[PDB]
Design a protein around this nucleic acid. Structure first.
Ligand SMILES: [K+]
Ligand SMILES: [K+]
Ligand SMILES: [K+]
Ligand SMILES: [K+]
Ligand SMILES: [Mg+2]
Ligand SMILES: [Mg+2]
Ligand SMILES: [Mg+2]
Ligand SMILES: [Mg+2]
Ligand SMILES: [Mg+2]
Ligand SMILES: [Mg+2]
Ligand SMILES: [Mg+2]
Ligand SMILES: [Mg+2]
Ligand SMILES: [Mg+2]
Ligand SMILES: [Mg+2]
Lengths: 52, 193, 353, 158, 98
RNA sequence: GUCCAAAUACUUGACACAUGCUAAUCGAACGUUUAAUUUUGGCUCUUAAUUAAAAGUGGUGUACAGGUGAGUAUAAUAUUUUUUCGCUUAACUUAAAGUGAAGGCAAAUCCUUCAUAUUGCAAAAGGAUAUCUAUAUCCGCUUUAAGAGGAUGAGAAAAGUUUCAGAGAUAGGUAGUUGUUAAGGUCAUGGCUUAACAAGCCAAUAAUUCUCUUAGUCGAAGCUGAAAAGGCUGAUCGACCACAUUGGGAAUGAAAAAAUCC
RNA sequence: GAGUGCGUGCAAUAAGUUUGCUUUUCUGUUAUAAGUAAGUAGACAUAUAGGUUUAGAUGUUAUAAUAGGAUCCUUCGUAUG
């Protein structure tokens, strides 16, 4: 949010929750895409290695 | 663990507590010998005393938890109640030379608003002032200009269960049809024959 | 919800002509459904309406509607309202304003902004202040809103004159004080009285109507006239309450009304420019009309408050009174002879009767 | 940037015989080989297929042996193109119009498609241009009236 | 609306759940998009542990669940409580201290 | 024929059905209606409000869940792999901007319409709670850019796959139909569309069409064999199709995907 | 002789519905006409007053053209014969 980037505090208890939920979805999406990517690379290397 | 909350001026005893939450729970007002029994009996003990059906027992255990946490219904934050009746009055402050802030406060029925001190001038939540000298809020009946009473009523805090009209959506046209038959058939017996 | 408008009490044939003209072509069509109300003004249905004219059951007797040439047959609302308003001469006649203004409100007729100030004057001078106060209270129906700084200033002028006409007796001054407060409470709380025309005039004055020093001086006048009578135990418990308000209101007026500023310098300089916004105060005739009781109020309050031992207020109120008197005297010199203002000021302030 | 060039990819090459020719312009029927496997009998059956091939210069005759390539869409039923003649029928190859290379046929599609875009940008700019003119004239008739009516009021306040 | 919820399986008096990624408006036990894990509500006990402590076995593919929470999946109240313990989301409910 | 647990339980008449229930919810969208309560004017009537109930109006959901197997005889704009793509005005996730003005119904977040929104076409809706001796918030609404999802476009190209019930009859079928030129349309491809020419294209052993009989389809889903691209079934489980007394239909909506509607 | 949840021809046909040498009507643009009804601007004057007069840039009313949507008619069309 433009307010979070500027460094402003939460306006109310509801926005504070929206900040935590939005951050939880950002942290999980980053850890999800990377975690699921290493699985693919680790799976393709094994196939390419055994098929060779 | 089973901490008991202290009674409040608006809910002083069990008969009042069971009268507010509704669901026809005031029937069992005699099962609980004291205020401490209500907040001490367990699920199994409430079942032996005869608090049934399970819907009423679970509903009671729920409101029993809300009272502990302080999640009262409407008017539960009052502080000056007498025989179950509380009077709401308006307190006016000059927020600016061209404005005025009005708050619905609860004070004794005799003392005037300006006479009461800040300590006893309680501000009830859920009630506001519309325009001037008008108190708006659930179960706020007017007594005079700038005054309204709030009396304990059956089901005042009740979570009313939903009810069907003419048997709901599926059986709406049929219940109205058959009902229309009973009407016409009645008129024939009155004026027809 | 409400009963259909009707005009069944008219003392003159001219009045009945104007009221029945608007009724049968400007008011009654408003009671028809939105569809039928379109046929009456359509040539394509002129033939049909001639045979089976649209009917609506009011009081049983159906009211027939035929084709109406929207341009050639429709009457002029401003002129008809004038012909009726000028022919009203009896209480039975003015009772029609309640229904007339209701019908215009239903027809969405944007009446002249000054029309309210005129109805208040011609009606109150005839001795029908209640008919006005009743329409104001029933604003949800009559649309008689207090959105003009002049209407409120005109209405509060008569509410005092009726009390002053009886030498400020307790039975009447008590009644007037209830009316003045009912208006200041409607201006503040009731939302029917708010409009863009009012927000503009409140921006030019910078005081909301319910706080405008010119209107608060009315409530201060009647209050100052209740304490003067006594300042029986029941009366003492009440008389002692009037003094609490007198010092309360007086101490509030001085906070709003600036120092050494009269009625023409009270508001911003841009307020007296527009002819639709507080320009009436420029004419000496209309200035003396409103600066009479206001000048008399500050003087009276300044004396009582002084007796109670309030040095500041005793000097603050005399500061305004001295400012309004200096200006009021100018108007008394520029006003033409035989004018209403010159007579009122001469009677209220001059006390010549 | 705005040029959508053809894929320009090379697919497989099939050898076949020309079955019909001269019936339609720049089109011949070519019979190629094939073999479909029957899973119940567990054997292969000859599965020859006849396609409509694109002959740009009409250089093929019936009974001719040619090499075709798929992936060259020209019509609703033509997805093959002639690559070269293996064995001619009737007359030698040099006595027939030459067969363009796939590059020449692809360059024609890019050139033909590019010209189509140039014709659109102009028809779009001109259409938008002639539209703004009409929208501009309305501003004139509405301005001369408003200006004539607004300057009049300003002239009565000097 | 994608949801991370539970699919009730097992036998009478023997509940067993599948953590699944399914559209909200579908049958509870219909074939979902993915099976993220399993959940057994009845707490178990270690074989050779006489301390009396109990535990609950829960298999969960945290990496696959984080991706769905990141794209806008809505877990039910039960799955929310589980995801909050592992440390992905914040609890929706807490024991009042006062 | 003693007990206990799990699992299964109209396979036939998609035969007819008494009775109670399976889809409702929001008063923080909206006013009506009587009830008391309290205030105005008049001298019981008559104003303006508060409160609680009962019907409604509007929003979302009844496009999910649950039931049945009557009809239905198939190769299809079906489907798998790789390459290349397109669309998406509801709901979910992240963010930005905008949330003004009238009229109709008793009123409205209903209906109608306007201003404004890179150029010029094109939007919106309000409600609620606190603070002070007007400000700030909460829940929404409109638009825009993305992620996810999708029932999405005939997507396209290359190479493949699909055991298509039983019996009988039928040799023609195709008329933008097949191709060329030109133009338009399309992300792109394709008579997809149009004009002008050519007479083609598919099929020849039944392509195409028709009659009769029977049937919901499929899966290591169930039973069975040592085994066969095994056989049989098509309950319980999952997927798909169809149906909601029978027949004939349309609209709404992001999408018919309704036990809805005509 | 009896039946027929069957196909098909012809006539007929509710809901719905294609086309256009059908018919009414609503709305949005464009160009005009009017300003008496409405509504919006400007000028002048009066005073217990708030009248007189003019004006179309935005609205309103009317006509024409044009665009689109609802009506009616036409076509197709269950039952039925
Ligand atoms: K369904
Ligand atoms: K079936
Ligand atoms: K026929
Ligand atoms: K017919
Ligand atoms: Mg061979
Ligand atoms: Mg059965
Ligand atoms: Mg089945
Ligand atoms: Mg707004
Ligand atoms: Mg290949
Ligand atoms: Mg075609
Ligand atoms: Mg069958
Ligand atoms: Mg017809
Ligand atoms: Mg006129
Ligand atoms: Mg028939």
């Amino acid at each position: 949010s433009a307010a979070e980037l500027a460094g402003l505090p939460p306006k109310s208890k509801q926005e504070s929750w929206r900040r935590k939920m939005a951050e939880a979805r950002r942290q999980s999406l980053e850890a999800g895409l990377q975690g699921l990517w290493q699985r693919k690379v680790k799976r393709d290397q094994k196939q390419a290695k055994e098929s060779k | 663990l089973p901490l008991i909350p202290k009674p409040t001026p608006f809910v002083p005893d069990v008969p009042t507590f069971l009268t507010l939450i509704g669901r026809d729970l005031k029937q069992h007002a005699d099962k609980f010998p004291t205020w401490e029994a209500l907040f001490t009996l367990t699920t199994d003990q409430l079942r032996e005393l005869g608090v049934e059906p399970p819907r009423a027992r679970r509903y009671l255990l729920r409101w029993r938890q809300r009272f502990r946490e302080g999640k009262f219904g409407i008017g539960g934050d009052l502080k000056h109640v007498e025989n179950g009746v509380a009077y709401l009055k308006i307190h006016e402050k000059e927020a600016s030379p061209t404005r005025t802030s009005r708050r619905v406060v609860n004070v004794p029925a005799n003392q005037h608003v300006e006479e009461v001190s800040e300590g006893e001038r309680v501000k009830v939540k859920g009630y506001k002032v519309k325009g001037v000298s008008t108190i708006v809020g659930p179960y706020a009946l007017p007594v005079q200009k700038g005054v309204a009473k709030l009396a304990v009523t059956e089901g005042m805090w009740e979570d009313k269960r939903g009810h069907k009209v003419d048997g709901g959506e599926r059986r709406r046209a049929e219940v109205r049809f058959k009902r229309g038959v009973a009407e016409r058939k009645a008129l024939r017996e009155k004026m027809g024959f | 919800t409400y009963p259909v408008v009707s005009f069944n009490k008219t003392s003159s044939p001219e009045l009945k002509e104007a009221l029945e003209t608007l009724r049968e072509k400007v008011i009654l069509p408003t009671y028809l459904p939105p569809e039928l109300r379109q046929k009456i003004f359509n040539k394509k249905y002129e033939k049909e309406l001639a045979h089976d004219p649209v009917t609506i059951q009011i009081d049983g007797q159906p009211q027939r509607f035929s084709y109406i040439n929207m341009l050639t047959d429709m009457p002029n609302t401003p002129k008809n309202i004038r012909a009726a308003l000028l022919s009203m001469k009896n209480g039975g006649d003015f009772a029609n304003l309640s229904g007339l203004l209701e019908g215009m409100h239903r027809a969405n007729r944007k009446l002249p902004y000054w029309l309210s100030a005129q109805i208040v004057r011609k009606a109150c001078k005839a001795g029908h202040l209640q008919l006005i106060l009743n329409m104001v209270r029933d604003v949800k129906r009559t649309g008689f809103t207090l959105e003009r700084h002049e209407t409120v200033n005109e209405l509060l002028f008569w509410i005092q004159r009726f009390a002053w006409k009886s030498d400020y007796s307790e039975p009447e001054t008590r009644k007037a004080l209830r009316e003045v407060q009912e208006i200041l409470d409607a201006l503040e709380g009731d939302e029917r009285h708010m409009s863009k025309d009012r927000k503009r005039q409140q921006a030019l004055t910078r005081f909301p109507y319910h706080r405008d020093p010119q209107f608060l001086a009315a409530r201060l006048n009647l209050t100052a006239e209740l304490a003067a009578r006594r300042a029986t135990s029941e009366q003492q418990l009440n008389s002692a309450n009037d003094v609490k308000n007198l010092v309360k209101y007086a101490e509030q007026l001085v906070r709003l009304w600036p120092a050494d500023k009269a009625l023409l310098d009270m508001y911003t300089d841009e307020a007296y420019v527009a002819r639709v916004d507080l320009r009436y105060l420029i004419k000496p005739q209309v200035h003396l009309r409103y600066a009479s009781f206001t000048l008399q109020a500050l003087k009276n309050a300044a004396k009582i408050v002084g007796q109670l031992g309030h040095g500041p207020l005793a000097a603050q109120l005399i500061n305004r009174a001295a400012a309004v008197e200096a200006e009021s005297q100018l108007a008394y010199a520029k006003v033409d002879d035989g004018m209403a203002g010159q007579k009122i000021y001469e009677m209220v302030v001059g006390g010549k009767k | 940037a705005a040029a959508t060039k053809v894929s320009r990819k090379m697919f497989r090459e099939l050898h076949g015989v020309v079955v019909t020719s001269g019936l339609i312009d720049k089109t011949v029927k070519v019979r190629v080989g094939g073999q479909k496997f029957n899973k119940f009998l567990q054997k292969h059956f000859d599965d020859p297929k006849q396609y409509l091939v694109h002959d740009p210069n009409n250089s093929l005759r019936a009974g001719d042996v040619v090499a075709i390539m798929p992936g060259f869409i020209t019509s609703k039923s033509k997805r093959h193109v002639v690559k070269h003649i293996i064995a001619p029928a009737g007359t030698p190859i040099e006595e027939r119009p030459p067969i363009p290379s796939l590059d020449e046929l692809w360059d024609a599609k890019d050139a033909a498609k590019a010209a189509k875009k140039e014709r659109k940008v102009l028809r779009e700019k001109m259409q938008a241009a002639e539209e703004a003119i009409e929208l501009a004239e309305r501003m004139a008739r509405h301005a001369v009236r408003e200006i004539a009516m607004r300057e009049k009021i300003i002239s009565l306040q000097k | 609306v994608l949801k991370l919820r539970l699919a009730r399986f097992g036998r009478t008096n023997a509940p067993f759940y599948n953590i699944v990624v399914a559209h909200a408006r579908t049958a509870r036990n219909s074939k979902p998009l993915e099976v993220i894990g399993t959940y057994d509500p009845v707490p178990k006990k270690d074989t050779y542990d006489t301390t009396g402590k109990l535990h609950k076995d829960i298999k969960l593919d945290v990496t696959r669940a984080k991706y769905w929470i990141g794209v806008g999946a809505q877990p039910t109240d039960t799955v929310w409580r589980l995801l909050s313990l592992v440390g992905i989301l914040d609890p929706k409910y807490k024991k009042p201290q006062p």
